[PDB]
Design a protein around this ligand. Structure first.
Ligand SMILES: *C(=O)CCCCCCCCCCCCC
Lengths: 604, 41
């Protein structure tokens, strides 16, 4: 049973309506199921432990028995009259609301009390590493004590109550074994209150540490089910939400990104220059679109973000072409009639809006750093919005210069300030971008081995690629973490892949002389580096031309392997290299024993 | 370390005590008590 206890308000006959939460002057009795007593007992148990320090310091008020907050009522206990009717409990143990209040504020008040002392006990305890993980190692008690008698700073609490803290301590450190009163010798065994827990944390030499290897697994299992690593290369529309894209604002360096390497950025590849004009704040400036191609951020295929083009440390040659100086650098949109990459001359450019200029010309924004005047780090920045560009077939964001007077000097300059580190930040997660279009769902499998070397590094913050990369990255840490894809152990991961290579290379051999019986020693090893190359750089699985990894099978395969692989690790997964791991722990205890030996001499 | 006597069953400077870690019993109280909503009830 569970929930609050109910009782037949109509008396005797208890039906699915003659019940009612048995409330009263104390609040409502909620049932205390077996396991929920484990907690409140485990919590109180950790407080009772500090008994010797509560009396010493006259705080506290006696040991806290959980049997002081409960009661022994009886009735039907459920979550609702209907279902509570199927849990007739007699003399169960319930805790009334007003009690659920004290057991709370008591464990809270006492928790402070101890939390404090417990902190002093520690700066003194750990102040001599009472924990080794291979074999033993003593340190003659006299010295030890006479030593901490020093180190411990005058405001601890282990100097005001030595054997009032010691008695608390003995129950937390199975290192300190108190000398028995009637034989005046230790005990071999150490009996700290955490008897079992402390036994099951020792780094057992057979397998690393059960508490470790156990969690590193349940931890990975969490992720595997959580983010949705499963279904990682699913071939079908998936809401961007399914990718929980967060804290995702990637930055670049356009005016370098080739147009074909990333759809969201077209260029004005035209013969001559395209000097246009525009009255901005009265003054008339001339946008240039200089000698080179001047790659500009396209506006369509640009998920309403927060574009913030930073222009700093980048050269600013106002020294040579004086034409450049005087011009306030500024991010400006450019609506063109004919599609760009077909826009020849000025009459082609519909209009030009200065979405964000920089007050003060190019001769105050400068700063000489050895001849080559740089740009005082400043951030121009628009706030592009999907629909503010409705209809408008062609429009481009360009972080240019806005020259107040074009001249012969700036005839080979080309004032694109795009060489600066631009940082787009998708401000509306629901919508992603792929191959130049804005969508609401991705098709994972499509984005695999479909980008090129740099059609990946040139991805646009929160676009399929960047999403089908953030995803693999989780799955990449589950294998990297739990599975042993980094040793000659032909693990579950590199194993799922090997079975694909076989089934694959086996049918490609079917029909024709079949002169080559499948290899296997070579297949195991080829798939080992395939699974390994993945854990290594999760990204690669997106680039066209990557051995194994990019065939449709793998990944879809890998994950579902790694999947079941985590759901069976056992507990002693740590047996892997638990030999050198062990031998390394003995190595430490031998060096730490060496320490105790000095504590033992210096302070005799 | 001044002698106490009864407050607690053990004297610190008491006869034949012994600091001596054993890789076998890693000292530990109770920190990870579960209280999260679903798990506490
Ligand atoms: C008398 O108090 C002399 C000092 C000896 C003990 C003071 C505290 C240092 C040793 C701690 C023992 C309890 C757990 C560390």
């Amino acid at each position: 049973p569970t929930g609050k206890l109910w009782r037949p308000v109509g008396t005797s006959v208890a039906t699915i309506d003659s019940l009612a939460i048995v409330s009263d002057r104390f609040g409502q009795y909620s049932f205390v199921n077996e396991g929920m007593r484990e907690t409140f007992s485990k919590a109180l148990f950790d407080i009772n432990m500090w008994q010797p320090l509560f009396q010493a310091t006259k705080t506290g008020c006696g040991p806290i028995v959980l049997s002081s907050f409960t009661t022994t009522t009886s009735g039907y206990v459920g979550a609702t009259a209907g279902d509570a009717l199927d849990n007739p409990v007699t003399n169960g143990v319930f805790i009334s609301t007003v009690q659920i209040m004290n057991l709370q504020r008591t464990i809270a008040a006492r928790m402070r009390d101890v939390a404090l002392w417990q902190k002093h006990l520690d700066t003194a305890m750990t102040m001599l590493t009472p924990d080794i993980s291979a074999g033993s190692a003593s340190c003659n008690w006299k010295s030890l004590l006479a030593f901490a008698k020093d180190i411990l700073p005058l405001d601890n609490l282990c100097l005001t109550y030595p054997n009032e803290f010691y008695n608390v301590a003995i129950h937390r450190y199975p290192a300190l074994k108190p000398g028995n009163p009637d034989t005046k010798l230790p005990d071999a065994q150490a009996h700290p209150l955490g008897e079992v827990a402390g036994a099951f944390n020792a780094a057992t030499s057979e397998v690393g540490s059960l508490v470790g290897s156990s969690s590193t697994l349940s931890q990975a299992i969490s992720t595997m089910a959580g983010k949705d690593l499963d279904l990682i290369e699913a071939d079908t529309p998936l809401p961007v939400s399914v990718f929980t894209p967060s804290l995702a604002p990637r930055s670049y360096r356009p005016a370098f990104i080739k147009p074909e390497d990333a759809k969201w950025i077209a260029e004005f590849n035209n013969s001559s220059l395209i000097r246009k004009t525009l009255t901005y704040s009265g003054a008339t400036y001339t946008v240039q679109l200089g000698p080179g191609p001047t790659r500009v951020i396209d506006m369509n295929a640009m998920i309403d973000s927060v574009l913030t083009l930073d222009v700093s440390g980048t050269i600013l040659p106002y020294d040579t072409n004086p034409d450049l100086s005087t011009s306030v650098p500024a991010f400006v949109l450019i609506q063109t009639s004919v599609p760009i990459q077909q826009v020849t001359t000025a009459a082609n450019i519909t209009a030009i809006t200065v979405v964000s200029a920089a007050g003060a010309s190019a001769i105050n924004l400068a700063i000489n750093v050895r001849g080559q005047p740089r740009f005082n780090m400043l951030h121009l920045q628009a706030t592009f919005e999907r629909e503010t560009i409705t209809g408008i077939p062609y429009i481009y964001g360009l972080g240019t210069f806005l020259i107040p007077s074009p001249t012969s000097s700036s005839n080979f300059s080309n004032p694109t300030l795009m060489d600066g580190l631009l940082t787009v930040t998708p401000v509306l997660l629901r919508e992603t971008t792929y191959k130049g279009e804005v969508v609401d769902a991705i098709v994972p499998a499509t984005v695999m081995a479909n980008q090129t070397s740099e059609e990946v590094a040139s991805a646009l913050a929160n676009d399929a690629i960047v999403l089908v990369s953030n995803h693999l990255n989780k799955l990449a840490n589950v294998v990297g973490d739990a599975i042993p894809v980094a040793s000659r152990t032909d693990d579950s991961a590199t194993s799922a892949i090997v079975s694909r290579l076989a089934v694959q290379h086996k049918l490609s051999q079917v029909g024709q002389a079949s002169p080559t019986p499948p290899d296997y020693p070579l297949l195991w090893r080829r798939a080992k580096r395939a699974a390994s190359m993945f854990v290594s750089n999760p990204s690669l699985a997106l680039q066209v031309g990557i051995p194994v990894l990019t065939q449709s099978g793998m990944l879809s395969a890998l994950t579902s392997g790694v999947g079941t692989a985590l759901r069976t690790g056992s507990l002693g997964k740590g047996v892997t290299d638990a030999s050198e791991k062990l031998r390394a722990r003995q190595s430490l205890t031998v060096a730490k024993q060496a320490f105790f030996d000095q504590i033992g001499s210096l302070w005799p | 370390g001044n002698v106490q006597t009864s407050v607690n069953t053990y004297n610190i400077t008491g006869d034949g005590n012994s600091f001596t870690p054993t890789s076998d019993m890693t000292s530990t109280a109770a920190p990870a008590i579960d209280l999260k909503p679903g798990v506490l009830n």
